[PDB]
Amino acid sequence: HNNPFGNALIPDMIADASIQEINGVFYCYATTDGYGQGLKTSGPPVVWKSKDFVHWSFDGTYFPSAAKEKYWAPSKAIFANGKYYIYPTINGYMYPAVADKPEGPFKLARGKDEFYKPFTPSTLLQSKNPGGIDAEIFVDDDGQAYVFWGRRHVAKLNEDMITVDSVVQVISTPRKEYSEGPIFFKRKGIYYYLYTIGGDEKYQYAYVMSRVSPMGPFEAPEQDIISTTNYERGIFGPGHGCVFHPEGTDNYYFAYLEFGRRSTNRQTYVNQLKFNEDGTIRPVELTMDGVGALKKVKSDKKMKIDTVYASSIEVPLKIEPMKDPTCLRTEYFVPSFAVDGANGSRWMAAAEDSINPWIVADLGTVKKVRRSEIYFVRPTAGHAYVIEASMDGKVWQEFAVHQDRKMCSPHTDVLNKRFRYLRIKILKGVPGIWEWNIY
Amino acid sequence: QHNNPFGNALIPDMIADASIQEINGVFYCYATTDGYGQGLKTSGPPVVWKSKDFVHWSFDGTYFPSAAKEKYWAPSKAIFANGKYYIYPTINGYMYPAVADKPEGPFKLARGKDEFYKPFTPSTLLQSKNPGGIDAEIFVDDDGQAYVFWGRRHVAKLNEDMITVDSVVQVISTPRKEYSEGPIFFKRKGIYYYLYTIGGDEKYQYAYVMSRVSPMGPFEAPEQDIISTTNYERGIFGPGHGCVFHPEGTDNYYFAYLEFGRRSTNRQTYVNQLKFNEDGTIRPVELTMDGVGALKKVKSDKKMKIDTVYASSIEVPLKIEPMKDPTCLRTEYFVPSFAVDGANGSRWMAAAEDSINPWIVADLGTVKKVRRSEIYFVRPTAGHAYVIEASMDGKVWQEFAVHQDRKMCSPHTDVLNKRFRYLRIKILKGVPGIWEWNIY
Amino acid sequence: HNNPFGNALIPDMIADASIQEINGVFYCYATTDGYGQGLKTSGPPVVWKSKDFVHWSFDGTYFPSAAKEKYWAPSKAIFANGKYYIYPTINGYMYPAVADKPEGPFKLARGKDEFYKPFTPSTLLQSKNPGGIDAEIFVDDDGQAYVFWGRRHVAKLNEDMITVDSVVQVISTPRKEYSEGPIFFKRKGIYYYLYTIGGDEKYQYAYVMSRVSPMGPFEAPEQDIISTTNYERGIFGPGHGCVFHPEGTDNYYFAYLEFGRRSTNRQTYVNQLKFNEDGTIRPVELTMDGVGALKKVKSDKKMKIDTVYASSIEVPLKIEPMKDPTCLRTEYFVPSFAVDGANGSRWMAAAEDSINPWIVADLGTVKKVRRSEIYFVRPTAGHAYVIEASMDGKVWQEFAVHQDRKMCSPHTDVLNKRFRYLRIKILKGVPGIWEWNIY
Numbered sequence A, C: 001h002n003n004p005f006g007n008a009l010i011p012d013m014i015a016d017a018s019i020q021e022i023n024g025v026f027y028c029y030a031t032t033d034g035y036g037q038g039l040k041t042s043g044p045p046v047v048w049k050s051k052d053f054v055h056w057s058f059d060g061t062y063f064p065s066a067a068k069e070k071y072w073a074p075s076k077a078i079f080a081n082g083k084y085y086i087y088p089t090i091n092g093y094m095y096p097a098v099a100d101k102p103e104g105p106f107k108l109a110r111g112k113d114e115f116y117k118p119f120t121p122s123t124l125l126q127s128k129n130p131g132g133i134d135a136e137i138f139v140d141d142d143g144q145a146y147v148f149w150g151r152r153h154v155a156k157l158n159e160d161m162i163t164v165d166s167v168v169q170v171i172s173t174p175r176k177e178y179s180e181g182p183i184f185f186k187r188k189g190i191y192y193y194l195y196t197i198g199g200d201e202k203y204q205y206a207y208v209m210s211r212v213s214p215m216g217p218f219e220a221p222e223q224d225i226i227s228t229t230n231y232e233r234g235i236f237g238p239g240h241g242c243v244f245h246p247e248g249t250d251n252y253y254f255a256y257l258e259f260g261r262r263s264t265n266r267q268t269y270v271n272q273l274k275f276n277e278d279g280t281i282r283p284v285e286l287t288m289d290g291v292g293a294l295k296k297v298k299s300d301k302k303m304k305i306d307t308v309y310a311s312s313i314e315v316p317l318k319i320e321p322m323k324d325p326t327c328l329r330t331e332y333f334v335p336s337f338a339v340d341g342a343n344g345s346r347w348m349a350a351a352e353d354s355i356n357p358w359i360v361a362d363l364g365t366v367k368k369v370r371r372s373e374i375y376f377v378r379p380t381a382g383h384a385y386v387i388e389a390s391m392d393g394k395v396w397q398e399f400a401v402h403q404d405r406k407m408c409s410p411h412t413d414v415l416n417k418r419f420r421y422l423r424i425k426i427l428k429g430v431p432g433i434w435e436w437n438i439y
Numbered sequence B: 001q002h003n004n005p006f007g008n009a010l011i012p013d014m015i016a017d018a019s020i021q022e023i024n025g026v027f028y029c030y031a032t033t034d035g036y037g038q039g040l041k042t043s044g045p046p047v048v049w050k051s052k053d054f055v056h057w058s059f060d061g062t063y064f065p066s067a068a069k070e071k072y073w074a075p076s077k078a079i080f081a082n083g084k085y086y087i088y089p090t091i092n093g094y095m096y097p098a099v100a101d102k103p104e105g106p107f108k109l110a111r112g113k114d115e116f117y118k119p120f121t122p123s124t125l126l127q128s129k130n131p132g133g134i135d136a137e138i139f140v141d142d143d144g145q146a147y148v149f150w151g152r153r154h155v156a157k158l159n160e161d162m163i164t165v166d167s168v169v170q171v172i173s174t175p176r177k178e179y180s181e182g183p184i185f186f187k188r189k190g191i192y193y194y195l196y197t198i199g200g201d202e203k204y205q206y207a208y209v210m211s212r213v214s215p216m217g218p219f220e221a222p223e224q225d226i227i228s229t230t231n232y233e234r235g236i237f238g239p240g241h242g243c244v245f246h247p248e249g250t251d252n253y254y255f256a257y258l259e260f261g262r263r264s265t266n267r268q269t270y271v272n273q274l275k276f277n278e279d280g281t282i283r284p285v286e287l288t289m290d291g292v293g294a295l296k297k298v299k300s301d302k303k304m305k306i307d308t309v310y311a312s313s314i315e316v317p318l319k320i321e322p323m324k325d326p327t328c329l330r331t332e333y334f335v336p337s338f339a340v341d342g343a344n345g346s347r348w349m350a351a352a353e354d355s356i357n358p359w360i361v362a363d364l365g366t367v368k369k370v371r372r373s374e375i376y377f378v379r380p381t382a383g384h385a386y387v388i389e390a391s392m393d394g395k396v397w398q399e400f401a402v403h404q405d406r407k408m409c410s411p412h413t414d415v416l417n418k419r420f421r422y423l424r425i426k427i428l429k430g431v432p433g434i435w436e437w438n439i440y
């Protein structure tokens, strides 16, 4: 029954999210988590898209040359010079990348389109020491671009979108710890600089404000902490994310990663960000409920599932804390979590059930089904599966067999037939499902 | 005291057909501007009044440059879609779609060249051979489907571009059959509400029907279907074309309506609460001219107590002629104390013969520190030129400010920050009268 | 399921289309292709009509004097002096023609209504050398008419709609090579001049804009190419066509020919044309799907056809490229292409089967069919056929005989008889069918 991870924005483990609206579609560029080796690897660069902010999907990678590298904290995609630029941190270093559209294909914008370790001459910074992470771009009303990065750095960025200015400043803040994940935006003539403090469960965002310029001078309000652990709601370490508003509106949203399952097993959540009359930010009221649909659109209504059952259920995961001894959560893996409408809950088969684990949705009666959409666990590594239908629960007809490990989510099967039961057998990939919708 | 039969109107001007809404934490009022003296042959220009608290309102200029000297009626609410704001006013008798980046404009025609000529431009909202119709009202349903409602019970879907009306036009069925205009449409707790006017002048009423199916029906009429009507006892005549709104994030609904006023196009707009019974039926509105006070807590300055006022002249009382109700028999007075009473329904007016530096003087009890003055003139959209002066004794006048050019705004604000006992305004151009004069 | 020519607008090979709405009915005036001798001949002058933009028809010719001439690239029909004027290129030269209605009959608007080679004194241009092709007419808000033609030429046109101004200008564009197929329109005070460059698969439309007058001065934006080959979608050489918008709407559409089966074997397609806030045109997103119905009209539902078969099937056509070696397609001619709802696909009988070629529709069982509408291949050359009906497909009964060619499309036969099998035997005309609908 109990789900401590609520309704995450995306049915995957993602962190460091950059969310924006481009041509009336929402885009979410993020670090893909869940790859099982802490900070030593990541998932590949993928972009999730949504017309409504509720139904999200991705197909393949947007950055072919970077597809096998460790990939962190992409910026927003920035439209300039007829192109889109993005600034991820690849094998620990920042690079400029460019494409004709936000879906890619992106290529390195400086030097050759290849990677080797520790870094190449293609790095964003061209100083002798080119270190730094977590680029954030701002283009001001006068057309001047700026790049912000980790440890409170900022510099002007040239109109070519790849040459950082030689004058680098460090922004003064009243909170002093190691900082990463800068967020910057301008609203009604006030510039806002948001910066992380702490890590793991102690992750917080604080901010400062300027009416002068994106490089300061800045001022700190009394109430300078925007996100922090909320014990009563069970929301821990609300860190590296972004601020966005849909195009043309004054409706601001704060997206944040959460501690999750520890280490790189984070999910991302969104809440409203509100301002006082004096222009100060109201500390965010954090929840795991999301903000619902941000555009009114038509969608097919999903079928009620009467019951679900599975070949096996993984044993509950008791998540060990890192820095907060009171952060004590347990994740269950029951079949009903595949169909509960919450992106923070998942069914997982038992690790020993490694030969065609399966799950059945019973619709209760025979019904006309249009299609199935399956959001598998670790979707960026791909899944091969079989989908079968039955009239009685015993006799099964194969509707479709997918032997390839297609890197996408959701996996959609068009059915248009009457049946009562639907079964998924997983052939390859991680045997779990975040969400399974039948229409 | 002298009697003020027009109480406390929402706005310090003559406005009708109001569309009031909260957008990004601020209230906006788009309306027909009345008080131009030629009945329905002309109107004032397109202006939008704004307020942070629903009590203090202001405007500056027009929001629709191309239409600023056209006859401008009955704008819709400003509708957010496709990253933009759309508005659908009735310009020289005909509906047009207009678009802007913010609710302040500048708005432009959404189709065709941004310009007007009579009787209509190819830019009209309707595109049938006869594109006649007035009083547009827009609804966007939870699924994104947009609809346009207009006079005589018309409704059609609107495309995602928000400017193309669908070829399928329906006529809403209602139990009251007479000429109707000023549609209001909204959805609350799964119920669709279609409110429509009946009558005109003092006989203006709102009636309504409801649906639980769709914005195009089918509709059901309740027994108690008249929601606004003349209240003889309170002296409130012909509560017609207005709107319904609720502040964002609340279930507090309000009904705004025009009132017969001084006859013809000399109407003002009033606001009262709108309430529902548990079954979703609308409770007939309890009309007052008292208003609903502040709908948001904002910081503002307290006003100075004025001790006496007097002027160069006072216009003779107006004995208002009824139109359709021979019992609607009112008189408006024009005394100087009406400039500072805190009611938007009352005004000082100089006599017709006093057209050369008419003036009014406020007398604070003693010498005090005076931060600023805010003047709401009569017919504010035609612009005013004035001189403000201050004095210690009522005899010798230091000039604080001089505005030889008409500025089309309201209020006119002048920072002094001096000590003074008396203030005086001399009016150089514009209608020589004042709804409200606030001194802080 | 393999039709590389998609859903063409018209069930015929047409190019250089001029499309418009007059009094609530859509008109398509075009070059008729598919006559088998390259640019040496064309089909005759025909106007296709449609009330919904989906079901199209013509009957005979609209321009009797020109009916046997080489006929290219008619302009739109322009309403002026209480009449309709059109400006086609006939045996290689432009001529003004005039009619009382858009259906014709049209006749030459100057001099004698007759033709001889190389040109007559009735030509649009009245200089000693009246050469020039591809007329496009614009009438501005002030009532001034202009004629645009090939190689970037433009002049004022007098209110008589036949006398071209002596002052002829050549429009300055950044791309300098051979151009034809001009398209001109005004939208919100901005003038748009679109012109072709290249040819065959290398056909592209480029453009310039003016805020001053139909004759300039003109400015080119950076993104000045608005149609070009889309290899991934298989759309090659999107050239000579038109822009139109239905009466009273801000919905602009771009119609274009494409390379098709090489040489004069082209079809026409339509997509939405969209604009940016700054007035620039967004490069057209080319597809072969069409834009569906642009008007609501009542029409009868087509009956499902259970199976189709024929006397023969032409061997697949392996289309050789012209200028682009990557343009590599194959056309099939299977019987199901006759009934698939796609104007880009057709059944064709084998060449050898020239005596009694036939095609059967098998409706699943016996049913009362109201009527048959047949869109033959090369309809402008005319068809003669018989239509039979059967219960079992062994013994047949004739339900209509048409011994004479008629030059129209579709060929309708009203039937109202119950049967399972409908058979068409083609007596004269090209033995092939783009579409065959039963109601």
Ligand SMILES: [Ca+2]
Pocket: A016, A017, A018, A073, A074, A075, A134, A135, A136, A181, A182, A241
């Ligand atoms: Ca970031």
Ligand SMILES: [Ca+2]
Pocket: A337, A338, A339, A340, A341, A342, A343, A344, A345, A346, A347, A433, A434, A435
């Ligand atoms: Ca779930």
Ligand SMILES: [Ca+2]
Pocket: B017, B018, B019, B074, B075, B076, B135, B136, B137, B182, B183, B242
């Ligand atoms: Ca209205």
Ligand SMILES: [Ca+2]
Pocket: B338, B339, B340, B341, B342, B343, B344, B345, B346, B347, B348, B434, B435, B436
């Ligand atoms: Ca007053």
Ligand SMILES: [Ca+2]
Pocket: C016, C017, C018, C073, C074, C075, C134, C135, C136, C181, C182, C241
């Ligand atoms: Ca042409």
Ligand SMILES: [Ca+2]
Pocket: C337, C338, C339, C340, C341, C342, C343, C344, C345, C346, C433, C434, C435
């Ligand atoms: Ca076909």
